[PDB]
Design a protein around this ligand. Structure first.
Ligand SMILES: CCCCCCCC/C=C\CCCCCCCC(=O)O[C@@H](COC(=O)CCCCCCCCCCCCCCC)COP(=O)([O-])OCC[N+](C)(C)C
Ligand SMILES: CCCCCCCC/C=C\CCCCCCCC(=O)O[C@@H](COC(=O)CCCCCCCCCCCCCCC)COP(=O)([O-])OCC[N+](C)(C)C
Ligand SMILES: CCCCCCCC/C=C/CCCCCCCC(=O)OC[C@H](O)CO
Ligand SMILES: CCCCCCCC/C=C\CCCCCCCC(=O)OC[C@H](O)CO
Ligand SMILES: CCCCCCCCCCCCCCCC(=O)O
Lengths: 177, 39, 92, 319
């Protein structure tokens, strides 16, 4: 029903936004082997910004990843400055604002389309971000739970996107009816 | 003795090998949305 | 739905031979079946081609001798070979 | 009990001595300690007069014969390679997903969802376009393109055709890379073989004629093996043949042991029957009954070995 569509869209927005924000914040992206803190080879949480240490003499010491240790420069820049993961959060926020503003200033019907575009674009940004992360890291390992949170954010964002466009289509159908 | 007797000197395609095709794909998805919105 | 039994067999055959579609299943259930057949076809056909590309790139034991006679066998009419055989305590 | 226990009894009968079997304290064959210059193992026991004779698989070497006395060889042999019989790990149930990495497969799913959604958006959002590409039909179109299984419908707009075009390009490149890698994914017999590699670990007894053979070998292949082995990790040097052998067995063939051919042949006939002797003998050497340098027992042991040789006592003990 129409009242259910908005509820699913709104709750999914919050969900995707929260998951992506937790993922960008937490440090459990890749459990791999390395240094917990140093100017020797133990398991480490290693997130997007900071690498910490699971098991070790300074188990708990977290240092900043030295992203910078032409094409590599550029990829290393795009990675260090997580422009793509961060842009996903920004777009998802904007999308939520639009969904919310579907109420006040109603009957505009273009706020809803904008919300769909923002959520779909957030999904695309996340996938570029994932590709950049995986490609960088590579020059054993297992992906943490924040990586998989990021992934679930993409899926939910795309679904909320499909719902948003569907609602816009219905609005204009009824307006044409 | 001192030169050579004591001498000290398939895999799956990784995402790194195909990342370019992903970049083109997402870029193309971007342009399609631009074309549509402009129309 | 044109997917009677004969058109189903034709659809499946065509898919394995990577050829035309004509009809394409249109329900969720039919599309699940179609999807897994498509996946199966891709893996199996790719594996045939790859392995062919490898196939285009790159009497035995004494028991066997004893067990057959089409390929007769003997020794120098007088020799150490004939004598070992005449005295071997190994059944074969 | 065993070859050397049976050999000792016959040796004593023919040498003409009464005897007491004692196991060498350090469990080694005998080498001049690289460092302290002290002879260890059975050779050391003879050199320092702790034992009057060594009825053991002790290889006749010059440095050994210079510090102990040896009978004629009671056994001819050579270093050999013991490998765990291959038995290549069977293909995994889902090994067909191998030509491409895990992350590629993950991102192929993500890209499928992305392409399908964007085709729906660009195709139906505009009110000025009112089967066609709804969400279910768009997912079906995308799957069909990837599985190369033809198209029932195709985008007609400029927007839809851009999406379709890039998805087709992506599919071609990704699918072709799978076929190819699969192709490639579907495309040691001596001491020389071991020497020209290192992957398969391989080493000698930590202390004895074998380690010394390589430290002294003038053969390029064996010196090459030695260069690697002294540095091989984990230390490919072992305290007993069985240790190298167990090293061989436990490695699923990742450890080859340079035990003497005699030991190799013996272990090949022992359960779990998982090992096999490969490579030729790495030297043309022999085992001798040893006595302290200049010992009176040397002459009896030389004579008894010849008696047990002409009788085939040692050869019977082998079989
Ligand atoms: C019809 C519609 C079709 C779609 C149209 C056009 C689509 C084209 C999309 C952009 C192309 C990617 C850019 C790129 O490869 O730059 C860099 C990586 O790039 C990165 O590391 C940045 C990661 C995100 C960029 C992708 C945004 C989308 C690589 O540097 P480069 O300068 O590209 O040099 C080539 C690399 N080489 C020299 C080492 C071989
Ligand atoms: C090769 C050869 C191709 C053979 C042609 C397929 C049969 C066609 C029959 C058919 O279309 O008639 C009807 C089925 O008619 C029946 O009642 C089916 C009888 C059972 C046969 C099932 C064989 C396939 C199963 C496994 C074989 C092993 C349906 O069509 P319609 O809607 O009546 O028109
Ligand atoms: C009319 C309907 C429109 C449909 C259109 C769909 C597009 C299909 C093709 C896509 C790939 C084209 C992009 C190829 C990118 C070339 C990259 C390049 O120039 O390589 C860089 C450099 O040469 C190396 O170092
Ligand atoms: C809209 C219509 C929908 C159609 C739907 C049908 C399409 C199905 C296609 C392919 C399925 C392939 C399944 C892949 C399963 C492989 C997972 C796996 O085994 O991975 C575990 C791995 O072995 C750990 O080491
Ligand atoms: C458009 C859909 C294409 C078909 C997608 C195939 C699904 C693949 C799923 C991932 C399997 C991962 C295998 C590697 C697992 C591992 O080694 O840990």
């Amino acid at each position: 029903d129409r009242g259910v569509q908005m509820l699913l869209t709104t709750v999914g927005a919050f969900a995707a936004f929260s998951l992506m924000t937790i993922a960008v914040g937490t440090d459990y992206w890749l459990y791999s082997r390395g240094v917990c803190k140093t100017k020797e080879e133990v398991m480490t949480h290693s997130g997007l910004w900071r690498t910490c240490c699971l098991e070790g003499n300074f188990k708990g010491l977290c240092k900043q990843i030295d992203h910078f240790p032409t094409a590599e420069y550029f990829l290393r820049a795009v990675r260090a400055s997580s422009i793509f993961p961060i842009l996903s959060v920004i777009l998802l926020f904007m999308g939520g604002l639009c969904i919310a503003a579907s109420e006040f200033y109603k009957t505009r019907h273009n706020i809803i389309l904008s919300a769909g575009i923002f959520f779909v674009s957030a999904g695309l940004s996340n996938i570029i971000g994932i590709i950049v992360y995986i490609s960088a890291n590579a020059g054993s390992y297992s992906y943490g739970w924040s990586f998989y949170f990021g992934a679930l954010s993409f899926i939910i964002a795309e679904m909320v996107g499909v719902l948003a466009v569907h609602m816009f289509i219905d609005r204009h159908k009824q307006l044409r009816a | 003795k001192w030169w050579y007797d004591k001498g000290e000197c398939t895999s799956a395609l990784s995402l790194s090998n195909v990342a370019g095709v992903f970049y083109i794909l997402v870029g193309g998805l971007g342009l399609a949305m631009l074309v549509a919105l402009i129309e | 739905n044109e997917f009677g039994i004969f058109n189903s067999l034709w659809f499946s055959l065509g898919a394995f031979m990577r050829q035309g579609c004509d009809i394409s299943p249109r329900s969720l259930s039919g599309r699940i079946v179609g999807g897994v057949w498509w996946f199966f076809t891709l893996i199996i056909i790719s594996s045939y081609t790859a392995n062919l590309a490898a196939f285009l790139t790159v009497i035995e034991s004494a028991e066997d001798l004893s067990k057959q006679t089409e390929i007769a066998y003997g020794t120098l009419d007088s020799g150490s070979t004939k004598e070992f055989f005449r005295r071997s305590k190994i059944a074969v | 009990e065993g070859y050397c226990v049976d050999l000792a009894a016959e040796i004593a009968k023919h040498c003409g001595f009464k005897y007491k079997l004692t196991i060498v304290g350090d469990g080694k064959y005998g080498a001049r300690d690289a460092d302290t210059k002290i002879w260890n193992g059975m050779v050391g026991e003879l050199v320092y007069g702790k034992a009057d004779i060594a009825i053991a698989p002790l290889t006749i070497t010059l440095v050994r014969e210079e510090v102990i006395d040896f009978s004629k060889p009671f056994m001819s042999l050579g270093i050999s390679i013991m490998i765990k019989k291959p038995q290549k790990s069977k293909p995994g149930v889902f090994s067909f997903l191998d030509p491409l990495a895990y992350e590629i497969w993950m991102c192929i799913v993500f890209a499928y969802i992305g392409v399908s959604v964007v085709l729906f958006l660009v195709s139906r959002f505009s009110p000025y376009e009112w089967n066609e590409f709804g969400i279910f039909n768009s997912l079906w179109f995308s799957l069909g393109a990837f599985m190369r299984q033809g198209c029932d419908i195709s985008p007609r707009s400029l927007s839809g055709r851009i999406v379709g075009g890039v998805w087709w390009f992506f599919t071609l490149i990704i699918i072709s890379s799978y076929t190819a890698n699969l192709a490639a994914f579907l495309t040691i017999e001596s001491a020389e073989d071991l020497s020209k590699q290192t992957e398969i670990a391989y080493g000698t007894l930590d202390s004895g004629s074998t380690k010394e053979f390589f430290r002294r070998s003038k053969i390029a292949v064996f010196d090459k093996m030695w260069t690697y082995m002294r540095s091989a990790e984990p230390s490919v040097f072992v305290r007993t043949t069985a240790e190298g052998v167990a090293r061989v067995r436990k490695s699923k063939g990742k450890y080859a042991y340079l035990l003497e051919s005699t030991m190799n042949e013996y272990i090949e006939q022992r359960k779990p029957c998982d090992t096999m002797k490969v490579g030729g003998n790495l030297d043309s050497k022999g085992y001798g009954i040893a006595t302290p340098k200049g010992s009176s027992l040397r002459t009896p042991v030389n004579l008894a070995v010849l008696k047990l040789s002409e009788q085939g006592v040692l050869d019977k003990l082998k079989n």
